[PDB]
Amino acid sequence: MVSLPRMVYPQPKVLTPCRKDVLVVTPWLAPIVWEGTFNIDILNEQFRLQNTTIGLTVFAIKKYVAFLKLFLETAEKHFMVGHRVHYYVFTDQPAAVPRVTLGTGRQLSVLEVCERRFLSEVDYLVCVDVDMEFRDHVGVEILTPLFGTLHPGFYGSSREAFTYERRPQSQAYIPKDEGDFYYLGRFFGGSVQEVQRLTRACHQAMMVDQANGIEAVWHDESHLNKYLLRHKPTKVLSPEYLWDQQLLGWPAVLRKLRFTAVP
Ligand SMILES: [Hg+2]
Ligand SMILES: [Hg+2]
Ligand SMILES: [Hg+2]
Ligand SMILES: [Hg+2]
């Protein structure tokens, strides 16, 4: 709500689309974040004036603790740089967490494996996997009440091809004539309130499923897709935000590869 300062930047072009090769807004008017759609300077100003704090959560159990060093090092270089960040590392090996040097205004909490905590420590929560690395900018352009990320393997696929759970006996069930996009179960976020709302719904749906002796085809991801179908995300991130260059290369439609799996 605080007034932005004078800023000098190119005037928006009303009669000139900001990307003519991709959809930049959903049918429910949520922006789809692609490179070229946002001016990061304006967005940085808006969020900094609000002294925004972003929590990044990851689970690293067993052999996965080995991915923490690169994950954290690259996050330090590309994730919410300039803003307050609180990393939450849930692990079964507290002593094995790498000693990574953090920039000012950034902290890390190791939780050995308390939800009200998030409500008082951060404004937004971003949930990802540890076996990844940031390769380019991932900033406040993604922040919104609730966001989902387009799966790199299905962004150009028809809904019939989406690997949603197709069995009516499952709570994650989505018929062939339904569905907007196929979202990643491993990269989502939003306000603490909305994220806890999504995880609480997923947890309940998965319990009902097991009680009925059924397990969704893609587990958590299947339920996340059911949730986002029925509760439209306020922002959708393009595949730039979770790519796999080994399996998909570098298409012209992707101007940047920001976050990827480690081969
Ligand atoms: Hg989370
Ligand atoms: Hg769900
Ligand atoms: Hg779940
Ligand atoms: Hg979920």
From Swiss-Prot:
Listed EC numbers: 2.4.1.40, 2.4.1.37
Free-text comment on this protein's domains from its UniProt entry: The conserved DXD motif is involved in cofactor binding. The manganese ion interacts with the beta-phosphate group of UDP and may also have a role in catalysis.
Reported impact of E141D: In allele B106
Localization per record: Golgi apparatus, Golgi stack membrane; Secreted
Cofactor(s) this protein cannot do without: Mn(2+)
Pathway: Protein modification; protein glycosylation
Role played: This protein is the basis of the ABO blood group system. The histo-blood group ABO involves three carbohydrate antigens: A, B, and H. A, B, and AB individuals express a glycosyltransferase activity that converts the H antigen to the A antigen (by addition of UDP-GalNAc) or to the B antigen (by addition of UDP-Gal), whereas O individuals lack such activity. Glycosyltransferase that catalyzes the transfer of carbohydrates to H antigen, forming the antigenic structures of the ABO blood group.
GO BP, one annotated term: lipid glycosylation
Family: Belongs to the glycosyltransferase 6 family.
Listed name of the protein: Histo-blood group ABO system transferase
Residues given in the record as UDP-N-acetyl-alpha-D-galactosamine binding sites: F59, A60, I61, Y64, D129, V130, D131
Active site: E221
Regions of this protein lying in the Lumenal compartment: 2-263
Example GO molecular function: nucleotide binding
Domain of life of the organism encoding this protein: Eukaryota
UniProt catalytic activity: an alpha-L-fucosyl-(1->2)-beta-D-galactosyl derivative + UDP-N-acetyl-alpha-D-galactosamine = an N-acetyl-alpha-D-galactosaminyl-(1->3)-[alpha-L-fucosyl-(1->2)]-beta-D-galactosyl derivative + UDP + H(+); an alpha-L-fucosyl-(1->2)-beta-D-galactosyl derivative + UDP-alpha-D-galactose = an alpha-D-galactosyl-(1->3)-[alpha-L-fucosyl-(1->2)]-beta-D-galactosyl derivative + UDP + H(+)
Modifications the protein undergoes after translation, according to the UniProt entry: The soluble form derives from the membrane form by proteolytic processing.
Tissue specificity statement from the Swiss-Prot or TrEMBL entry: Expressed at high levels in testis. Also expressed in pancreas, uterus and lung and salivary gland.
Keywords linked to the UniProt accession: Blood group antigen, Glycoprotein, Glycosyltransferase, Golgi apparatus, Manganese, Membrane, Metal-binding, Secreted, Signal-anchor, Transferase, Transmembrane, Transmembrane helix
Co-factor remark: Binds 1 Mn(2+) ion per subunit.
Glycosylation site residues: N51
Positions annotated to bind an alpha-L-fucosyl-(1->2)-beta-D-galactosyl derivative: H151, T163, E221, D244
